[PDB]
Symmetry: C3
């Protein structure tokens, strides 16, 4: 009925468990999207995604810490790293002049799914924060991550010469 966390134990359906459990779910979706980005044209994105998976483990670990039992690993440095990539990718992709619908190339499509799962994880983290103090940087990281995912989804389509699917 309960599970152990870092510095204590909580019920298996505790919002804390839901939080890092959904981070795990998002990390798994990214893992799948990566199998679609093994092309030589995406070595950079694949490599960045791979690192993000480790950082997601960092996020899950931090969220599992009760009363700062051990040091937090997610820092503002990792958030700013994502922000720089987001800027670069927005620059690479064609100008955004229409509302985008999720889809296009299969790689971009799976990235859009991962994007929504990351956003779902963010909501769970917000819920956790409402009852216990957390590494607030984790929330910022996950928030920027969905923006990063949206950005590379459009870059993935563009590199493959596929127009983004637009609301029209």
């Amino acid at each position: 009925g309960t599970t152990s966390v870092i510095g204590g134990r909580v019920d298996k359906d505790d919002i804390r468990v839901e939080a890092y459990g959904t981070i795990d779910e998002a990390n798994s979706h990214i893992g799948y999207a990566m199998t679609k980005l093994q092309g030589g044209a995406f070595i950079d994105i694949y490599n960045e995604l791979e690192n993000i998976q480790h950082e997601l483990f960092d996020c899950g670990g931090d969220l599992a810490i009760v009363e700062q039992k051990i040091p937090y690993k997610v820092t503002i440095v990792m958030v700013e790293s994502l922000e720089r990539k987001i800027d670069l990718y927005i620059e690479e992709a064609p100008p955004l002049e229409r509302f985008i619908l999720p889809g296009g190339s299969e790689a971009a499509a799976t990235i859009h799914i991962a994007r929504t799962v990351v956003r779902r994880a963010e909501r769970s983290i917000v819920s956790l924060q409402k009852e216990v103090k957390i590494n607030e940087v984790v929330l910022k990281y996950v928030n920027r991550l969905s923006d990063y995912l949206f950005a590379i989804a459009r870059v993935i389509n563009a590199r493959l010469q596929v127009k983004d699917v637009e609301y029209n």
Copy 2:
């Protein structure tokens, strides 16, 4: 901790955000399934899915309308459209004689996943509706959409010469 919606702002974990966010999740699964349905053999289903992505996006917009600054976009006409297609596809598919397990062709399998996500979205909309007034057509649309997805999943397997996976020990 909050996010801007149409007419104001709400907490990021507000049941309203969970609702349109999950609608977005379902829409993304549909986008992925569509990448497996581009052939000439699926032009009818693919076009209907293209339209559904728009209506799903509209559903999300209607759920994000806190301070009704604008009229809702999802109408009953769109729900009836799904109902007619559901009957059409049930007719096309083989007789349903056993319980169906999700799977079969890759295309059908992804459509089945989308179906379960649409149902998860429906549950969030039900919860939202209990707390605030919503465009009730959205709930009806989402409810019909999962039946439509189930229907085309079977049609997809049939067209692809694959038998549906059945519960049969």
Copy 3:
């Protein structure tokens, strides 16, 4: 705003519906993963997953039963079956001493997603059990299933010669 279940009716957003609805979601991911495992190299895992889809369907049926209207279908025998396969696959897979990134081959990746959805279903079942009586065996089954999925995910990658990627916090 309600839905029919076995021996009654409940609100469509009832924790009970969330539970079997998520079992359904997990079952659908398994079904998709199965399309990637039809090769001769995975006959054993594919057949086990075929059976698991039935058991998962049974889990949902058991969760939809209000006040033991009918006998439960999920039994401890099926839980033990999972446990035996778990040891078997941990034995086949290379030694594991660190957390690893979920992914690798397309098949393993989809299995990892299924694993996380099964765990999400487990949380809903835990919540359900706090409100009403349920077939406790279902909770034990879903609990073991996520470990089984983790195990075959690593085996699938191993069989495809895909090496696990260990978490970069090397002291963990």
